[PDB]
Amino acid sequence: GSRRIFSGVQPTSDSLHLGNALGAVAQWVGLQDDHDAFFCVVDLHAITIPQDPEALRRRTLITAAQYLALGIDPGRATIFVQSQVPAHTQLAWVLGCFTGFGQASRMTQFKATTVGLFTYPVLQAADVLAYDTELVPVGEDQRQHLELARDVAQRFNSRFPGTLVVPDVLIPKMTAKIYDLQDPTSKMSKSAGTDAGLINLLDDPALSAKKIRSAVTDSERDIRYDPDVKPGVSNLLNIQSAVTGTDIDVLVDGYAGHGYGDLKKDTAEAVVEFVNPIQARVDELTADPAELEAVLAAGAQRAHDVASKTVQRVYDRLGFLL
């Protein structure tokens, strides 16, 4: 329970992309050694959009496998599937009763729609608050969601002091947003349309290298870090720095006198070396699922033990008959 953290990714495709891996999971890996961590595959969130059932099940497992292959350690952290812990939807109903309609209407994605698309930020708040979470490591695109979660927790604690932990949001600087390679002002997302700007962890590594070589850059022939003036170039530097461990300024210094072909070739090569061991791990975890299944089953038990107590505390404060 020391420095408890919570985070999750939707099983909405066959592969995470660099945004997920560098903007979220890489932070998780650094945090798990000294933080008590719950890492969730949020399959309940996935069905806000129609999902093919066979694919949804398959992608749930492969999202968890990508956690292990990115270095999440089941001996140090808990990995579980959202839908296996009923407390999430129980708390979501309670929190929705403390969430203003206008609050939810102002959320960016909503602001065709279903109730699920309207209320998922409330389920997201429940996902975090159910585990007495102290810190939430996400990318920048989640900031507005977790401000709602903090507001609703404080509004609830107003009525019922000390019931819910109010979580701090932990959003990195450099990898807060990995951008699409074909449109470097737009964040890398699973729905860019064409995925030529999208780098998937489990895609054929030469296809990813090819996409990096075609990355949009500028006209200045000057490798320097300036995301607002030089989006493409700064993104590439961000990617290379993130997958290598080399600081951006050390890279920019080494790139003095170099052109953009050298920047793309080096980033392509670094990414290829990044994803090759990931793909080998995921392949084995898919071919031999017993290991992954035991991890998720232990995770669910642990998650349930924690989450159910939070729900019973909340229910007791509200005055429900227990």
CB of 288 to ligand JE0, least distance (A): 28
Q: Does 42 bind ligand JE0 (CB under 6 A)?
A: yes
Dihedral (Cα; 262, 265, 267, 271), 10-degree rounding: -170
Rounded (5°) CA angle 179-180-185: 60
Residue 139 is a binding residue for ligand ATP (CB under 6 A):
yes
CA distance 4 to 165: 10
Please state, in angstroms and rounded to a whole number, the distance separating the CA atoms of residues 33 and 27.
Answer: 11
Among 25, 70, 138, 306, binds ligand JE0 (CB under 6 A): 138
Residue 225 engages its own copies in binding (rule: CB under 8 A): no
- The edge-to-edge listing of strands for the beta sheet with 77-81 is 77-81, 37-41, 5-9, 135-137, 168-170
Strand 135-137 versus strand 77-81 pairing type: unpaired
Q: Please tell me whether residue 190 binds ligand ATP under the rule CB under 6 A.
A: yes
Structure tokens given for 266: 């080096």
Region of 7-15, 61-69, 70-78, 284-292 interacting with ligand JE0 (CB under 6 A): 7-15
What is the spatial distance between Cα 64 and Cα 39, in angstroms, rounded to a whole number? 9
Structural tokens at position 21: 């891996």
Contacts of 106 (CB under 8 A, 6+ apart): none
| Residue 301 main-chain phi, psi, to 5 deg | -65, -45
Of ligand JE0, its own copies, ligand ATP, none, which one sits near residue 259, judging by CB under 5 to 8 A according to partner kind? Answer: none
Q: Which of 15, 48, 234, 267 binds its own copies (CB under 8 A)?
A: 48
Among residues 72, 130, 136, 223, which is the contact residue for ligand JE0, using CB under 6 A?
A: 136
Say whether residue 23 binds ligand ATP (CB under 6 A).
yes
**Distance, CA of 9 to CA of 138 (rounded, Å):** 10
Kindly state whether residue 85 participates in binding ligand JE0, applying the rule CB under 6 A: no
Please name which of 273, 272, 291 lies closest in space to residue 283, comparing C-alpha atoms.
Answer: 291
Least Å from the CB of residue 266 to its own copies: 39
Q: Which helix (H) or strand (E) holds 41?
A: strand 37-41
Q: Which of residues 76-95 bind its own copies (CB under 8 A)?
A: 81, 83-84, 86-87, 89-90, 92-94
Q: CB under 6 A: which stretch of 4-12, 96-104, 195-203, 210-218 binds ligand JE0?
A: 4-12
Find the binder of its own copies among 3, 106, 143, 159 (CB under 8 A): 159
Q: Report if residue 298 touches its own copies, rule: CB under 8 A.
A: no
Q: Which chain residues interact with ligand ATP by CB under 6 A?
A: 9-10, 12, 19-20, 23-24, 138-139, 141-142, 177-178, 187-191
Indicate the annotated binding residues: 10-12, 19-20, 127, 139-141, 178, 187-191
Indicate the annotated binding residues for L-tryptophan: 127
